[PDB]
Structure 1
Amino acid sequence: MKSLMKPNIKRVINATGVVINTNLGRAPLSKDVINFISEIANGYSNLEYNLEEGKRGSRIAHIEKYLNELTGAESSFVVNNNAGAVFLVLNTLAEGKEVIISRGELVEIGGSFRIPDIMKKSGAILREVGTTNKTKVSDYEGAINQNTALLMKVHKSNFYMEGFVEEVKLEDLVKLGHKYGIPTYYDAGSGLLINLKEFGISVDEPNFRDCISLGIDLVSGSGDKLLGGPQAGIIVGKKNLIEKIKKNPIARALRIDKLTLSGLEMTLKLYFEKRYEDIPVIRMLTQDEKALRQKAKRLEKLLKDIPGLKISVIKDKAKPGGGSLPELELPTYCVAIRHDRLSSQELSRRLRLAEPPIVCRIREDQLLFDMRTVFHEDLKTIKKTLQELLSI
């Protein structure tokens, strides 16, 4: 009420070394993108407009061409967020009909998003198969009947399983779907655009391009995860299906705003131009082990002067991607600090309440600043923030 003297949203210095952070706003955007967003929003535009023909035009039009080239899909479409994509794909293709999905992929992502809950709401009929931990091909096949509208796979973005476990290979799903003439729908969630192994990160994570050339009929994902774009629900695949989807009156309630759209176009342009270093989420996961040290030591050089301050620099295995690559472990350089008068728990608590705030990881009352997620300009702001707190 009296907090209305200032906006509650503030920039925040991320030292958790966690690149995709559900809590801290997911993917940050490059300055290139943001200016472009800024430019389009400052006045009028050709949002819904064809300057060639002097008539109204589709907004999606702008984007879809990039997506089809980059992923290789026959057509594409973009809605508010992946939650909605999932929703839309189901309500559109499977209303009143059965959707076969593994008992192990019925996930909850975030607080309010639960596959079965949203699937129910869609109008779709959930046919669950296999077991929590193991699901075989026979499980999918067995549930096929006259009323089967769709074979579905969700990628477990936020958690993973270990031990006695089994999963169906996507090849097999497509094979299966082809054989019964049932469409395959893959919610990959991460919105990874192309293979990770190209940037020197070896992982199995599915990307649009590859899962499309594998013959999956529809593939969706979030824009603000491994795409490192703004928030969006990205769908790509068979033209016939996308079309039924674009037609669903619901797809108008899910229609993206001019800010995300513009931001998403530029992000795609960057990809087209192979400018990966210019989209933060990728730059951050691809950063050189030496550059992390270089940064860590650069920070330590700034903090020596501060009183009661114990400063070290460690080398550690961390899990950088939070809402995308949970199994992934990459080495990074954290800068560890300790204070005499204050427990690290109270230091951390004081740092969050600072302006601007700083969020970091703690281990055994040893305070860690993971360099992975820390920008150049933040260094200077960490020093000024620390001496103001400790030297008061």
Structure 2
Amino acid sequence: SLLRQIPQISKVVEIFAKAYPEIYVVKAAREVAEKYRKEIIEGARADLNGFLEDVERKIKSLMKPNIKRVINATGVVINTNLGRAPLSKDVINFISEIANGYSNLEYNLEEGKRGSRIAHIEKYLNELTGAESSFVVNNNAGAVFLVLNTLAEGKEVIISRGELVEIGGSFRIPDIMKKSGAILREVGYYNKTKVSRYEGAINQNTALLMKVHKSMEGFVEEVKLEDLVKLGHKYGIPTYYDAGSGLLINLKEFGISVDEPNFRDCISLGIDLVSGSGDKLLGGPQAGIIVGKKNLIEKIKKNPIARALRIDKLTLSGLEMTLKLYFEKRYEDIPVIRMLTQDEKALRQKAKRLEKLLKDIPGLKISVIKDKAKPGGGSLPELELPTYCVAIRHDRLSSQELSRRLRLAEPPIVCRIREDQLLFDMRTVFHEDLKTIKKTLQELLSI
């Protein structure tokens, strides 16, 4: 007699007339009905009062989109979980304009006939990298696959074994390379690699000489790209470097001195092909960018799989604007550049601005700390930049529970934990959000 007591859908329809829409009601009822069937199936529940209540909560949740914006307090500029680079509204205004109606995407308005959509971008990339040609695909994972599968299907690619390991590519890249159609001839060891070891692997099947970007142990011997180019010329073998960061120009120009491959220097070094991610250090939309020797790029363009990796209108549109800014050197308009160029002093400032807003909250130990951080994500761990974070602690509540409620808030707030203290990194935080932090913080703690 207990399970039959679960009310008919039609009856819950009655309950919510103009209360909510019928269709969203029925979706909520069914979902709960299934759950509440199952609770009593395992005999876990003796109660049918919560039927009505939780239905409503579904309805309450079914009517807000699954994707939602979020407040990043992690200080990781490139946050893979939080969607990597965000976009200036300039870019987003361009994208929206094109997206809203028909366009010249695959049309050539001069000739009055069809055209490639990479025409729109190509010349920018060429300009900035100094590469003979360029092509853009869905993402850099696609790029790699496309480069190998195009140049070396059935033929060998020589690469060091150290570039088959990764926790940040989660072996997704190696696994693609292994699935690319090419025969990888691995050389050297994890830490051990000499140029000769490469040359020693050169043969009648050799198609390509490949280097990938590395991300720790005591020592690692590795080879200067110059030796690879040298080698590749010597034996008539194209050289490919997956940079992956997508870093367009040298960093030194923004006041950051690090060792990082940028397209322009890699091409000027003599690599035949370089490929990178559009949405990491380029701060653009998701893309795989490839630049280099024309004959190569040309071959790749003609691989049919390249139709399976063809970028959508939006990412293209967005990527043109992104590129137009880079040419006009408007780096302040490129979110990821803006945040990384943020000054040490201006960061202390923002942390203190918040700290003042939180003394009026009970049970709270607010502290402000200077920390060296890695805002590149697990992608670019070589990148160390100082930041001021806002550390907090609550007596009654653990950070593990505190943050659990922060992320469960509207809006949600995401921040790193250190030793049962909630750190807010100011690097990733728009001044806008600060009020909404205090607001949402005290609201939770208020009940």
Query: Same fold, TM exceeding 0.5?
Result: yes
Return structure 1 stretches of 4+ with deviation > 6 angstroms: none
> What is the CA distance between 1:164 and its match in structure 2?
2.6
- Report the structure number with the largest CA radius of gyration: 2
Q: Give the direction of change, closer, same or farther, for the CA distance of 1:368–1:233 in structure 2 (3 Å limit).
A: same
Which whole-Å CA distance do the structure 1 matches of 2:86 and 2:306 have between them? 26
Instruction: State the 1:106 CA deviation.
Output: 1.3
Structure 2 residues not aligned, in runs of 5+: 1-58
Displacement of 1:127: 0.3
Structure 1 SS opposite 2:248: coil
Evaluate the alpha carbon distance shift between residue 372 and residue 116 of structure 1 in structure 2; reply closer, same or farther with a 3 A threshold.
closer
Q: Is the 8 A contact 1:107 1:114 kept in 2?
A: no
TM superposition shift of 1:184: 0.2
Report the Cα distance in structure 1 between the residues aligned to 2:317 and 2:253, rounded to whole angstroms. 27
> Using the alignment, how far apart are the partners of 1:135 and 1:287 within structure 2?
38
Q: Which runs of 5+ in 1 are unaligned?
A: none
Q: Structure with the greater relative contact order (CA < 8 A, sep ≥ 6): 1 or 2?
A: 1
Q: Is the 8 A contact 2:389 2:426 kept in 1?
A: yes
Identity of aligned residues (%): 99
* 1:142/1:372 CA distance change after superposition, 3 Å: same
Q: Deviations over 1:240-273 (max 9, x none)?
A: 0000000011101100001100110010011001
CA distance in 1, matches of 2:305, 2:298: 13
Distance 1:143 1:83 in 2: 25
Aligned partners of 1:306 and 1:391 also within 8 Å: no
Q: Which is worse superposed, 114-123 or 214-223?
A: 114-123
1:6 deviates by 2.9
Q: CA deviation at 1:113?
A: 5.1
User: Residue 162 of structure 1: SS of its match in structure 2?
Assistant: coil
How much does 1:327 deviate?
2.3
Q: For the residues of structure 1 that align with 2:60 and 2:137, how far apart are their CA atoms? A: 36
Verify the 8 A CA contact 1:98 1:126 in the aligned structure 2: yes
Q: CA deviation at 1:7?
A: 2.0
Three-state SS of the structure 1 residue aligned to 2:162 is: coil
- Contact 2:70–2:412 (CA<8 Å) still a contact in 1? yes
> Partners of 1:385 and 1:2 in 2: how far apart?
19
Shift of 1:369: 0.4
Q: Cα RMSD (Å) of the superposition?
A: 1.6
Shift of 1:323: 3.9
Which piece of structure 1 moves more, 297-306 or 259-268? 297-306
Question: Residues of 2 paired with 1:133 and 1:96: CA distance?
Answer: 28
Higher percent of residues as strand: 1
- On the 8 A contact 1:106/1:154 being kept in 2, the answer is no
Distance 1:308 1:2, change over 3 A: closer
Report the Cα distance in structure 2 between the residues aligned to 1:57 and 1:219, rounded to whole angstroms.
25
Measured in 2, the distance between the counterparts of 1:4 and 1:113 equals 36
Q: How many pairs were matched up?
A: 389
Q: Report the alpha carbon displacement of residue 134 of structure 1 after superposing the two structures with TM.
A: 1.3
Residue 110 of structure 1 and its aligned partner are, at CA, apart by: 5.4
What's the secondary structure of 1:310's corresponding residue? coil
**1:119: how far off?**
2.2
Matched-pair contact (CA < 8 Å) for 2:145–2:180: yes
Secondary structure class of the residue paired with 2:158 = strand
Deviations 1:82-115 (A, max 9, x none): 0110000011010110000001011446577534
The verdict on how the C-alpha distance between 1:211 and 1:12 changes in structure 2, with shifts beyond 3 A counting, is same
Offset of residue 314 of structure 1: 1.0
State how far apart, in whole Å, the 2-side matches of 1:256 and 1:291 are. Answer: 38
The alpha carbon displacement at 1:12 in A equals: 1.0
**Deviation for aligned residue 1:4:** 4.2
